[model samples]
Target chain A: MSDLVTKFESLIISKYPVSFTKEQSAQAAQWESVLKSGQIQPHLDQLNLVLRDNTFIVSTLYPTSTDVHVFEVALPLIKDLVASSKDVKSTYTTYRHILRWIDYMQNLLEVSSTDKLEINH
Target chain B: MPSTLTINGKAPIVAYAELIAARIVNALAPNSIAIKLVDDKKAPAAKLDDATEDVFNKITSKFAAIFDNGDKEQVAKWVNLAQKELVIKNFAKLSQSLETLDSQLNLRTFILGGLKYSAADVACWGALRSNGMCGSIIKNKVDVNVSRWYTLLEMDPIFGEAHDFLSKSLLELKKSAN
Candidate 1:
């Protein structure tokens, strides 16, 4: 895991046990500042890369962890992050991209896993 | 240079919507209790994509129809249009509706469960922010209901703090413009 991920994971495990770490929190705050600054396109592109990579690892590895029940443990935070990202972007395109990335990650987790990850719908 | 308003990254509006929707989903989904949104037992990620598409279409179509020209006149026109849309003849009706949504969300929040400081809160925050921005433009022109919601949202701690900071910053800009 990257320092960003390790820092976040440790923070979440120790504090909320379900929340993001200082690094993730810091990154989110920085991103919010960038978005609020009103220079949109480049930042949007940067966010796309970050979310895609971050979510993939989160979806895949999160499920296999012995300590946490993947569904009970990880999804809320993911939802929360996605929600926050939406607030910052305020456009459909950004929402769509983020959602797509999330869906892709979910699909990968579903197919790649040895356990039967039950699909709710 | 003036800041460019582009809809890239996680815009505040989307964030707000996501926050609200996450809460709504947490509240409404049958097996939602104690489950995170990204868990394997949840519905396929495609569902989220669908919801995002729906919200994106709704906001953009409204945004474009109001200000394609990118001029002050167009901006004012949008402000005026938004104001007109929020109007109610009386304060009673306004308060009733606001209470309804607030109560509904509150009830739902209780029943559906929420994350501890989840992004759902952020979504609601963003929605309130956009509503606040647009609402501020026509607070005087519209009925008390619009103002009421605006005030309530403004008073919310999460959004309230951000709104106050932004309002002061914008006011400074306006002062400099004079």
Candidate 2:
């Protein structure tokens, strides 16, 4: 759990600074609960959880954008945790949640940035 | 009282995303709530009450359960993609995601690979139609799968209705600017 805590601690810091909204705080509170439970609710899939988790944590901690920078800044450590936790049964569920969070966050950032650019006239 | 959705006329892509999300929710549970759209040229981009990104999140969040009722990842994969992905201003990373979607759509009718046209299609197509890159992609067949998918979606009465509303509203705004 120390390793997992350290990995999450590394991600808790964000380079972009964004103010936290009450809604975000509430979502984070829910997420923290789910993290402790070791499983996400069935209706609240990993994809959805990840989206909220990233937005709440990253947007609140770092300078935020609907851009790639936010996504780039947030994903690495969690991916590392997923690989590290694969062999550890006790931490698998938590690591899986982190993995899903990064996956969803990555997609959100990629799609947000990609849908914006204009090609040649 | 019936709900009202006030869209910022300056940003049609964002407005379209919100409108489409509402429309999809309507499709899933018709008349569950009536949404009246108000295209305000003077509205802020991130107002809580306005139909910009902020309000879009609220709208989607309000309807998340409905969308998720349709599919577990429906809101996250589709609604989130439109509200978060297509509403940004970064094009460099934008191409990568766009290309990825093109490939994803290569073998599917809708974004989710399911037969039905759910909010996933509505949201993705809605944002793309209102975007500048859409024209280039459609015209040049930049991504054949997306082009075909987009072309088909634009013809739908629901999506077409949103397009016309946004087009006329923005046109009126430009005229008022003169």
- Which of the numbered candidates is closest to the native, going by highest TM-score? 2
Model 2 residue pairs with clashes: A16-A62, A16-A63, A17-A62, A17-A63, A50-A101, A112-B85, A113-B94, A114-B94
Q: Estimate each model's TM-score.
A: 0.24, 0.47
lDDT of 1 by residue, B1-178 (tens): 1111112122222233333333334344433312112212323321232343444223333334321333434334333322332233445544454453343232111111221222223333354355544444335633222333344344334445544444454456567767
lDDT for each residue of candidate 2 in A42-80, tens digit (9 for 90 to 100): 423453344322322433322133223323433543344
Residue A104 displacement in candidate 1 (angstroms)? 28
TM-score values for chain B across all models: 0.29, 0.71
TM-score of candidate 2 versus the correct structure, residues matched by position: 0.47
Q: lDDT per residue, candidate 1, A62-103, as tens digits?
A: 222211222223334445554556464443334433443434
RMSD to the hidden true structure, all candidates: 21.5, 18.6
